[PDB]
Amino acid sequence: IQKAIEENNNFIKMAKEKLAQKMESNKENREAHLAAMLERLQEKDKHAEEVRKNKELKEEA
Amino acid sequence: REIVHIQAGQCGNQIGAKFWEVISDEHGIDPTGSYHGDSDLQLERINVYYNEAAGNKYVPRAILVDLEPGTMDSVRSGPFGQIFRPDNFVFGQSGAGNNWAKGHYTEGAELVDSVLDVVRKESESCDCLQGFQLTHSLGGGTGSGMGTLLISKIREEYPDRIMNTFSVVPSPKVSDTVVEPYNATLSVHQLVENTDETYCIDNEALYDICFRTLKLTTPTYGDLNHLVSATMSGVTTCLRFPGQLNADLRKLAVNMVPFPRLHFFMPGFAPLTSQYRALTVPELTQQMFDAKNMMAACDPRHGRYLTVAAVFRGRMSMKEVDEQMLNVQNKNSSYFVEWIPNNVKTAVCDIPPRGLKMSATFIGNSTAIQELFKRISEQFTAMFRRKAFLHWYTGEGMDEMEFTEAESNMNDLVSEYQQYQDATA
Numbered sequence A: 001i002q003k004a005i006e007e008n009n010n011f012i013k014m015a016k017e018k019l020a021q022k023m024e025s026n027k028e029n030r031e032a033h034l035a036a037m038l039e040r041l042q043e044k045d046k047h048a049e050e051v052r053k054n055k056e057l058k059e060e061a
Numbered sequence B: 001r002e003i004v005h006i007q008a009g010q011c012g013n014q015i016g017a018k019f020w021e022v023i024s025d026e027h028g029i030d031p032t033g034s035y036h037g038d039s040d041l042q043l044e045r046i047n048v049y050y051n052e053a054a055g056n057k058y059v060p061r062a063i064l065v066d067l068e069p070g071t072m073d074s075v076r077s078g079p080f081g082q083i084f085r086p087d088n089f090v091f092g093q094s095g096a097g098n099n100w101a102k103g104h105y106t107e108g109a110e111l112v113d114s115v116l117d118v119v120r121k122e123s124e125s126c127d128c129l130q131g132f133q134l135t136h137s138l139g140g141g142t143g144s145g146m147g148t149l150l151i152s153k154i155r156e157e158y159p160d161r162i163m164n165t166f167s168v169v170p171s172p173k174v175s176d177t178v179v180e181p182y183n184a185t186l187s188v189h190q191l192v193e194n195t196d197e198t199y200c201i202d203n204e205a206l207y208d209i210c211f212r213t214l215k216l217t218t219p220t221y222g223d224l225n226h227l228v229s230a231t232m233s234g235v236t237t238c239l240r241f242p243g244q245l246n247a248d249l250r251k252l253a254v255n256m257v258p259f260p261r262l263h264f265f266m267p268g269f270a271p272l273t274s275q276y277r278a279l280t281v282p283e284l285t286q287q288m289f290d291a292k293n294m295m296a297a298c299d300p301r302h303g304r305y306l307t308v309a310a311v312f313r314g315r316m317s318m319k320e321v322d323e324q325m326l327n328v329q330n331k332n333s334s335y336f337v338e339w340i341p342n343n344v345k346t347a348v349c350d351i352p353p354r355g356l357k358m359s360a361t362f363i364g365n366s367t368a369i370q371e372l373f374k375r376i377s378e379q380f381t382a383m384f385r386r387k388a389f390l391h392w393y394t395g396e397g398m399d400e401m402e403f404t405e406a407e408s409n410m411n412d413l414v415s416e417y418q419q420y421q422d423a424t425a
């Protein structure tokens, strides 16, 4: 009976951990995807501010 | 000399209920517990199975056990439901799910102490406890698993008392589930150590008898239990009624069990019923030694008798039974071991069972009972070599060596029967 309790508890333990593991890795992965998406768009805005600044130097000619 | 009765599980409680119905009728006790009989011979040994309660009421010395309340509620509502002591109903709620492990280790262990409490209260009220009898099946979980657990616990508190059982052996022709060979093999190993007498009631034989001999196309468990209750009545007649036989459980065991492990008996009954023609003494003796009247699906001509006991009921020529009993000896003299002289016993009870002028009960300790254990062992190994359906058991904490050990012990039991079957003087 002690063994039976031991197995039921371990099955619950392994399940609780593996689930928590999966849904921490998934949170990390989705955040890393959107973080890269925004950083790409923010890098676009730099090139946009640079294009505006390059027009401003030649109109001073 | 009081006996304490225990019935566990679905099968155990139903055949147990019929039993109390039958002997209650024979002793003149009505469903309410009042005596309305004609002869004082009915009461001289009523104390063996009944307590005398206030109001000149007689109450069976029986304990009813199960892990689910279903069958026990049916019993409390049945014909003789109100005769049992209400505090002797001990039940759980979950059940055993036809799992030996649940009855023996997990679910049954939770309830076993409560059952032993009722045993003590019944035993403390015994002038001189003679022993215990258990009714149960070996194929389920409660009667099989918890039943053997109870036996182990009883031998602990009452180590010097006789423990006998009426055990129903499983058969594929009458099967509720597939793990029945597992449960039976685990139970038998317990019975080999912790019982003095086990009457092997084989459902295969009860079905073949109802179908082939009695010509019943669709036998129900009720039809099989009619045979079982009649036999148990016949087996217990030597204690329940007052002949000049001073029969005690230990004395009977001493006379029938030459070796401690070989205590598995073949029951038999005659005539087989479900007519009015008076049966003759030659017919009673010839039928009771016939394979068609045996409750264990084994051929007595495929083995040899260690001991035999024949019980006759009714008013007949005690001389004629002896002549016919001595006659049958010659017709099967090769099938009786010659190294146990005068190993055939005969008893007579003047009181017949209900609606039968003459009957006969047969109790044989034959090495042919080995055929039954081989059958169960084969069904066991067919699954175990592939580890089929084991998860049901390993999930309850059992290791696989417990299955291997139980298997080896039953094969040992088979081999022990074989050495004495070939032994000669």
Ligand SMILES: Nc1nc2c(ncn2[C@@H]2O[C@H](COP(=O)(O)OP(=O)(O)O)[C@@H](O)[C@H]2O)c(=O)[nH]1
Residues within 6 Å of the ligand: B008, B009, B010, B011, B012, B014, B096, B097, B098, B137, B138, B139, B140, B141, B142, B143, B144, B168, B169, B170, B171, B174, B175, B176, B177, B180, B203, B221, B222, B224, B225
């Ligand atoms: N003769 C007879 N055998 C039964 C009956 N019910 C069950 N069995 C046998 O017991 C096995 C099933 O076990 P079960 O009765 O459920 O055990 P439990 O769980 O302890 O009640 C089957 O293989 C049947 O052969 C019955 O009413 N009469």
Ligand SMILES: COc1cccc(-c2cc(NCc3ccc4[nH]ccc4c3)nc(N)n2)c1
Residues within 6 Å of the ligand: B133, B164, B165, B166, B197, B235, B236, B237, B238, B239, B245, B247, B252, B253, B255, B256, B309, B310, B311, B345, B347, B363
């Ligand atoms: C399972 O609980 C019980 C309860 C009651 C009886 C028995 C029982 C009956 C029995 N048949 C009659 C008999 C047999 C050999 C004899 N030898 C001298 C007298 C004599 C009488 N034989 C055995 N062994 N037990 C078992």
Ligand SMILES: [Ca+2]
Residues within 6 Å of the ligand: B110
């Ligand atoms: Ca519980």
Ligand SMILES: [Ca+2]
Residues within 6 Å of the ligand: B113, B114
């Ligand atoms: Ca206790």
Ligand SMILES: [Mg+2]
Residues within 6 Å of the ligand: B010, B140, B176
């Ligand atoms: Mg059942």
